[PDB]
RNA sequence: GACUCGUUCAUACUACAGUGGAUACACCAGAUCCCAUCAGAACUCUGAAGUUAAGCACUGUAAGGCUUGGCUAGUACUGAGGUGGGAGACCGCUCGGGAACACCAGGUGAUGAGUCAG
RNA sequence: GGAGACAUAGCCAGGUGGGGAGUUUGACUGGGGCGGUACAUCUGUUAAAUAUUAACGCAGAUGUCCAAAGACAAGCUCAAAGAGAACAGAAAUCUCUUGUAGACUAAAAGGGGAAAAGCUUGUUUGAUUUCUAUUUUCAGAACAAGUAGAAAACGUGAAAGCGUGGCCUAUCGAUCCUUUAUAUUUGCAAAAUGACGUAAAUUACUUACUACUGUGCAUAUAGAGGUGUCUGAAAAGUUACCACAGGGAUAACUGGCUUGUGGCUGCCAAGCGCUCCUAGCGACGUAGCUUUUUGAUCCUUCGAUGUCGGCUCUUCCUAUCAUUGGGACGCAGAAGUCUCAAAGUGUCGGAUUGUUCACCCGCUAAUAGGGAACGUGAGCUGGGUUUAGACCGUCGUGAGACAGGUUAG
RNA sequence: ACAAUGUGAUUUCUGCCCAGUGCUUUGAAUGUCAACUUGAUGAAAUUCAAUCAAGCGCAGGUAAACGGCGGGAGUAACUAUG
RNA sequence: AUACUGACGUGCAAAUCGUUCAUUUCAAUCACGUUUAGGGGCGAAAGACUAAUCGAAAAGCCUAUUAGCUGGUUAUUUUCGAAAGAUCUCUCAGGAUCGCUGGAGUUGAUUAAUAUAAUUUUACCAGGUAGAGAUAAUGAUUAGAGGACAGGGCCUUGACCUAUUCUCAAACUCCCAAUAGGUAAAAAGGGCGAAAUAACUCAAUUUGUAUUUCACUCAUAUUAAAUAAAAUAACUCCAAGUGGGCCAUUUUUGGUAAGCAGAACUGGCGAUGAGGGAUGCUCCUAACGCUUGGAUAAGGUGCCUAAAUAUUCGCUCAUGAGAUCCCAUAAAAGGUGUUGGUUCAUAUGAACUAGCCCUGAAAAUGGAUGGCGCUAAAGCGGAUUACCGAUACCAAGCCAUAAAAAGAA
RNA sequence: UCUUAACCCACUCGUCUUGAAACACGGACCAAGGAGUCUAGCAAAUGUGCAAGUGUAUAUGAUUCUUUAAACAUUUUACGCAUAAUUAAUGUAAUAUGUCCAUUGUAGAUUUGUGCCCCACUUUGCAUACAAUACCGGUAAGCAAAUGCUUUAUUGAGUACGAG
RNA sequence: CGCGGGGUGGAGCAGCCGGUAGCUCGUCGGGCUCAUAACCCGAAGGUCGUCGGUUCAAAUCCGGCCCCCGCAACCA
């Protein structure tokens, strides 16, 4: 029964009451969707680097104890 | 809309590769008495109380999605392929 | 009323005059890195990978590159909040951004200046300072060669 | 002097003229084979007898176009302000920003990589 | 006596069944309703140069079609115009020249498209299976449509490459249910249904070792069968016999804004007025005023402002019909006609009506026009629209309905 | 005679239509059409067939049953109408 | 129980009374007893009646039925304080969920900063609305001119070609604003180097890619452009109220228009006192503890009514003058009223022009520049000051709230 | 203190409604009574007691007997919820075992030192955020002589020194 | 003035279901008969309301105008 249709009125003013919130801008981002093959090689590289670090850490610690 | 009777296309299962299939039209089966919902519906319907479920009198479409039965030449398997809602459908007899 | 994909694009996705047809190969050869900023600017010839209306002329970081696709993180205002949205665009629609290129040039000149300043052992101020300060100044025009002006009368 | 791969994508276009052919390009000669058609026209293959007549390059033209610049014009238009004006329609003023067509003058390209005869 | 294994009675079952029961009969909505869909959607425009954005805004389109009009490659260039050629002419086919698309792109409209995205031809079926990140709508859920990739198997091309439908923007549908696909995955509740399979053993309830084990039902995963009131009730009429809950969120009554329509006043100067623009006129045109018209409207009032008209009674207005004073005249007088100051004064009897209005007949001196809550219902009247009874016509299968007519209230 | 209706003294009459919607009449020749029953099948559940039911359908009857009861052109020695 | 629509209509009476009128030997009237009972009876049919009860009696109960709807919904101070948009909805008087709000917590913060920002700067883009155009395309569209198939009667008219020419478009576009929009301005980082890792990568284990470890070093000891009561920032939790709004400027669509319907941006009101606008929810000024004083704003200063019958220059007399935005009427058109201008002619004659004033200019209780009044203004147009003028503004006191100092003899 | 005055100001309150001084609705007046409660289950908050447990259930017991209808006690695998997830489901199910050490990053509270104390380096590095790997149940795909397997995908309210 | 149906020969219907427009009466030519009809034989005639659009092809299908008939004006 005979309604009014629309208005954008006050909505912008309401938005400015708490301001328009913006990105948190993280340095790391979850990478599920990113380039297969290249990213699984990156996973192998990363695992490789971790293994390299582990080998270095274990040998150095064992050397220090002796 | 017109499809031929045969198609070389991928078989996924029991044959693992592109091979011939014969192409046919799904006929939409027919209900059997021993279905669980029908068992439930018959029992509820039975006795005093008349009809116990809705009756879908309302209709808007005269058309049907067409779905092909693909029957593998190499192996014993069937595979479905469904395609756009049609009022007009043909098997073979090309232009 | 209706709200399909290209809704309201008659003027916007028109070609510019004298720019009709396919564009040069050497546009496509242009090299892109992850973490580049990149503008999304669309020639209307190639129809696949065409971004939505809002992203035309927008700029954002490349976060992902594919075979002929580029993922670009673009900000969109959704009512009371701006959020980053993953716009996939084509080699055709990417333009290397220029704000970064001013920073790069600025850095290069500053680095040479820093090398010189350190070499001379005297401080400098990098700052792109104010506009408005004017020194005192001289007019050497002959005293009857100056232009004498008055208001303009009517028709 | 010449060519190939290019780049910008008309200063590179279009139109009518004139000027040029060491090497080169091209026009040109042939059809067995590969090939291709109705057609050796094209395309494919094989030639090298002739030629600037064309293609092509360069230049010219009260050329047309494009292209820069002036001039159109601080005109038209326009943001903000005003218990400003005007019966209203509208029009000033204050703070600001500011075109387009026509017209007139200039211009008619530049360039990366490689090669051959200087 | 008569009838008789038929009746009848009981219990099943089909049919008939408004006699009776219980119930349904959307919404938006320039009020209600006939109508339409603005109810799912797609284009341009409205929309005010990112985007956003409404109306029963505008111009529209939609519920498909396509084994090619799909896929890849290759070749080609279209519409048109000029100049030519038997039949052959304005159009038929063929040729040469000119041809930035003026063609065509399944269908709308708008974008894009010339060594193509058009046309011709060749080879084909990727219009394939599996999966993300996403983009659109937007909750940034669903569904639907997309984009960019990935894992497969291939198709095509000389290769680079390209192909996960249609050049792009449209062409569509939950839960439950049914149905067919799919599986070295499962279940049907203390157990079993290949097969006593393969070994040994042989007094027998022997002893090991075995991925593949009845019908039927249930799953799990994947489609399809549909809901257009399209984020999904199985739902026709009717009430002037009616009731209830609300409603000035909404008509009929005043008022109000406006003044299209009506009415009144202008300006002008082509004609008319013998002759003569304007004595009187005045078109084609063009400006105002008003709300005694009818509208448009829905601000005000629905826990009520008594719904028409007449009668009666008073007052105000002037845009003066007559009476008083004048001006002009197409004016001889008599008249008469246009006009101004003027609202002091007057403006009637009937016939016919439900009547404002209208229309006759007659007087008059003339029988002007309006306001006052559409003047005036605790002033009247109750004839009329309009309660409940009734009638006729038409319409409705019907019950009933009718700014159709009538009588009684 | 009982039950059920319509019309409404007298007088004068009561035209057309059984198509529609009703009601009504005949029936294995006959289309459809139920339970039970009967047979076939399978290891059984089951799955299939088969069966002069009525009804409807086909075929009649009926309007003092419900009801209903057209449109155009042309045409006469004046003119007009037809 | 027909009529007087009589009396009566807080009655003699919740239907009486008066007068009139119908009935009176039969389908008559009267009594008593009797029958038929609630979706039932009974009905000479009016849905009539069935104990002041009826389109379903009375009594009691399921029942405190149900109600998206109406009404009402109770001491005080202090603090923060909205929405009337949105999505889906048999949804449009409703609900849910978003938005905005509050509480509570934690994180950040205390280092004049960095994070950060309804802001600009300098870079850097993206545009096709206003504008402008028809000699750029599309759709229009008025004229002639110059040329080599058709009409009229060798000649002429056309069309048609070619260059022009007039006026043009929300849904046309060569070109094209302002406004609005986006990215940018360095330390969890960036430079240039080395070494590592790969099943990614190329012919090629440094051939790259990316990552990791070590290096060397970039402004910030005024901050790689400003400015910032920039942490009053974040973030999590839990919840409310709300979903009918309205008004103004400017842009604006429909509609004859509308205090009309519908949008856009922003500001108000709503939810708001106070001073002005004569009065007035919205206009203007301006947002408010309690007080004292000041000086101002909007606005005034003839009197009502506080301050000037101030100063100063013009213009203005009206037998219905005129007098502060919204705001309560007013135009085309005239004027030998007066005032300035400007073009012409010969201190005169013309012609124009805009200022005031006049005509154009009629309505309804008695009547409204607010009223009285005002004309050497208290009118209209300026200017010059002074004075008056708010809870706004400054200083001071006191109160509470918020934060900060500082403190466990 | 009460009382009139006088100057200036002063519209019926409640109410629904965008909007009431209203020609909107309710209210003649005064007194008393007169409307967000209670139960169930759930959630977050904050307090409190305990913690890989917790509650003591029904009930038993006692030198417990106006108030006692509460209070007190409970001769070592009861039950609820939490200590494990996954899943139609037979089921399966958490660093991987060379190590009583005890997953990888980047910020990040806290600590050593140097050049009272803020400091400026270094130094060590929780919560938490952002990521990352592992690994378990489901599902794919590849394999499959069943102690079912396999790098790779995917998926769960997962898990990576328990919080209830 | 708001809804929906229809325009084809002189007249009235077919085609009007996309290409090739049929039938009757009327009109026209010839017979038959004192004479005239009736009767018999044979033909001619459609421009498909009008302006524009689709499609290989439109009288037909697609719109807008022009006429023609049918509905509609109710609660106010």
Curated annotation (Swiss-Prot), chain B:
Q: Where in the cell is it found?
A: Cytoplasm
Query: Which GO BP terms sit in this record?
Result: translation
Q: What InterPro entries has UniProt attached to this entry?
A: Ribosomal_eL44, Ribosomal_LSU_eL42, Ribosomal_zn-bd
Question: What is a single cellular component term in the Gene Ontology annotation?
Answer: cytosolic large ribosomal subunit
SUPFAM superfamilies reported in the protein's UniProt record? Zn-binding ribosomal proteins
Single annotated GO MF: structural constituent of ribosome
Keyword annotations: Cytoplasm, Ribonucleoprotein, Ribosomal protein
Q: Which residues cross the membrane?
A: none
Main location class? cytoplasm
Q: Is-annotated flag, keyword Repeat?
A: no
Q: Which Pfam families match?
A: Ribosomal_L44
Subunit note? Component of the large ribosomal subunit. Mature ribosomes consist of a small (40S) and a large (60S) subunit. The 40S subunit contains about 32 different proteins and 1 molecule of RNA (18S). The 60S subunit contains about 42 different proteins and 3 molecules of RNA (28S, 5.8S and 5S).
Family indicated by similarity: Belongs to the eukaryotic ribosomal protein eL42 family.
Record function comment: Component of the ribosome, a large ribonucleoprotein complex responsible for the synthesis of proteins in the cell. The small ribosomal subunit (SSU) binds messenger RNAs (mRNAs) and translates the encoded message by selecting cognate aminoacyl-transfer RNA (tRNA) molecules. The large subunit (LSU) contains the ribosomal catalytic site termed the peptidyl transferase center (PTC), which catalyzes the formation of peptide bonds, thereby polymerizing the amino acids delivered by tRNAs into a polypeptide chain.
Q: What is this protein called?
A: Large ribosomal subunit protein eL42
Q: Organism, per UniProt?
A: Plasmodium falciparum (isolate 3D7)
Give me the gene this protein comes from: RPL44
């Amino acid at each position: 029964a005979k309604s009014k249709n629309h208005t954008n009125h006050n909505q912008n003013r309401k938005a400015h009451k708490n301001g328009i919130k913006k990105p948190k801008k993280h340095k790391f981002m979850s990478r599920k969707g990113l380039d297969p093959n290249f990213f699984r090689n990156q996973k192998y590289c990363l695992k490789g680097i971790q293994k390299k670090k582990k080998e270095l850490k274990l040998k150095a610690k064992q050397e220090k104890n002796n | 809309v017109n499809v031929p009777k045969t198609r070389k296309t991928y078989c996924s299962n029991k044959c693992k590769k592109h091979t011939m299939h014969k192409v046919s039209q799904y006929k939409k089966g027919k209900e059997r008495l021993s279905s669980l919902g029908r068992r439930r519906y018959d029992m509820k319907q039975k006795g005093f109380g008349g009809q116990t479920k809705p009756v879908f009198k309302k209709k808007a479409k005269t058309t049907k999605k067409i779905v092909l039965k693909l029957e593998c030449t190499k192996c014993k398997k069937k595979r479905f392929q469904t395609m756009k809602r049609c009022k007009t459908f043909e098997m073979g007899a090309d232009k | 009323k209706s709200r399909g994909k290209r809704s309201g694009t008659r003027y916007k996705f028109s070609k510019k005059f004298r720019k009709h047809g396919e564009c040069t190969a050497n546009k496509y050869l242009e090299k892109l890195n992850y973490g580049d900023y990149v503008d999304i600017v669309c020639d209307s010839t190639q129809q696949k990978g065409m971004p939505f209306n809002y992203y035309h002329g927008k700029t954002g970081k490349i976060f992902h590159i594919t075979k002929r696709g580029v993922g670009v993180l673009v900000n969109k205002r959704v009512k009371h909040r701006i959020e980053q949205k993953k716009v996939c665009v084509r080699i055709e629609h990417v333009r290397k951004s220029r704000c970064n290129e001013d920073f790069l040039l600025r850095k290069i000149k500053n680095a040479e200046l820093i090398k010189e300043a350190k070499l001379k052992n005297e401080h400098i101020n990098i700052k792109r300072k104010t506009e408005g300060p004017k020194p005192a100044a001289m007019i050497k025009v002959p005293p009857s060669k100056i232009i004498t002006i008055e208001p303009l009368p009517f028709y």
